[PDB]
Design a protein around this ligand. Structure first.
Ligand SMILES: CC(=O)N[C@@H]1[C@@H](O)[C@@H](O)[C@@H](CO)O[C@@H]1O
Ligand SMILES: [Ca+2]
Ligand SMILES: [Ca+2]
Length: 398
């Protein structure tokens, strides 16, 4: 699902975020209502010519796999710009843009940009609409969001282009989507751990959900709405004590079928350290007691190792089963801190359980009270030899 991008009002700094909507089957439906049709894009020009056959028209041909590239890169004296002319004066609030997507994908990405408007067909009467930047990645298809503005001509300036050779796979234009912008303001800030005032009760939130039901990408809003709901209904952090002990029931296939969360419920895994050699994080969840992750950063006086696993579906767990590397036992979580989040994204973790067990071969369970998990954090509060290793990390239900 979609994650709220934060509210934008403009001073005139554009909100730039990854355009994840492209990976959805709802795109055609969304484009139907909000996209400025390509048939409305009359013509295009630019001030820097073109490299080889990467002609400027290829920037607005509706094909992400064809690109324009400038013939003259940015330097101290020259800034690449593109000017799109529309059939009629068109109200636009968003540009969806990608750099070239060939073998040199990302090269020429508009790391910094300015957007200008003209209501006339000719002459330099352009006024500045919005300035923006995107530092995350050069390879991304990004949504650039600014104040809804009338354009006969839209000028896009490559204030900073990655490696100077400005490129564009596509420039796409969208009309204002008020409900989408309402969704984007669901949380107070980028940490998304506090619901905004206009949705800060279940009554308000549920009514908002109902308001969105006819929206073409309503299905993609559900995750964010559920996230807000989880926050609104969250109970105070009251960590219990986890009883740890050696177990062997992981061998029991039938038992696993009933009580172990399916491995395919794991959306992603990450950790706060790196990893020593080729003992990467993914082999902590490969269902192989012989392969193990090892940390690339040991437990300092000010540092604990912690591993984070995201789930597709929220699940209620009472046990987390783990083991160290079986050769040495170096990195056995002698003392464990377990954190639960009921949201898919955001700074919404809370401590649920604490426990300790001596370093031992095999697998160890950490049994606590039934807790809901959308994501889990496994912290090495105390570890053997100050390292951190996991051969397997498993999640068991009550
Ligand atoms: C494939 C590839 O990277 N091609 C690029 C080309 O598009 C242009 O940017 C050129 C500038 O000298 O550098 C490379 O050859
Ligand atoms: Ca193209
Ligand atoms: Ca493993």
């Amino acid at each position: 699902g979609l994650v709220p991008r934060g509210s934008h009002m403009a001073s005139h700094q554009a909100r730039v975020s990854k355009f994840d909507l492209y990976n959805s089957d709802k795109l055609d439906a969304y484009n139907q209502e909000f996209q400025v049709s390509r048939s409305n894009i009359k013509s295009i020009n630019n001030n820097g010519g073109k490299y080889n056959s990467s002609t400027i028209d290829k920037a607005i041909d509706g094909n992400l796999e064809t690109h324009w590239e400038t013939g003259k890169p940015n330097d101290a004296n020259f800034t690449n710009e593109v000017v799109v002319t529309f059939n009629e004066i068109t109200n636009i609030d968003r540009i969806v843009y990608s750099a070239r997507r060939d073998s040199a994908r990302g090269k020429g990405f508009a790391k910094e940009f300015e957007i200008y408007a003209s209501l006339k067909d000719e002459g330099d009467d352009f006024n500045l609409v919005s300035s923006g930047e995107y530092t995350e990645s050069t390879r991304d298809l990004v949504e650039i969001k600014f104040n809804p503005t009338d354009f006969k001509r839209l000028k896009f300036k490559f204030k900073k282009a990655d490696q100077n050779w400005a490129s564009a796979a596509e420039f796409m234009f969208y009309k204002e989507d008020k409900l989408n912008e309402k969704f984007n303001g669901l949380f107070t800030d980028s940490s998304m751990n506090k619901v905004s005032e206009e949705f800060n009760t279940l009554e308000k939130l549920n009514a908002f959900e109902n308001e969105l039901k006819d929206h073409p990408i309503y299905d993609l809003y559900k995750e964010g709405l559920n996230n807000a709901r989880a926050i609104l209904t969250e109970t105070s952090e009251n960590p219990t004590k986890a009883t740890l002990g050696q177990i062997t029931y992981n061998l029991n296939d039938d038992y696993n079928n009933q009580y172990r969360m399916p491995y395919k419920n794991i959306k992603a895994i990450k950790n706060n350290g790196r990893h020593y050699a080729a003992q990467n994080i993914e082999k902590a969840i490969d269902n192989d007691v012989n392969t193990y992750w090892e940390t690339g950063t040991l437990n300092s006086s000010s540092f604990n190792n912690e591993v984070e696993v995201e789930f597709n579906d929220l699940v209620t767990l009472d046990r987390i089963v783990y083991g160290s590397r079986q050769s040495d036992l170096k990195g056995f979580a002698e003392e464990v801190y377990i954190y639960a989040s009921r949201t898919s994204k955001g700074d919404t973790y809370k401590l649920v359980a604490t426990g300790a067990h001596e370093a031992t071969k095999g697998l160890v369970e950490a049994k606590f009270e039934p807790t809901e998990f959308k994501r889990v954090k496994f912290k090495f509060k105390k570890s053997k030899q100050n390292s951190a290793t996991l051969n397997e990390l498993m999640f068991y239900k009550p």
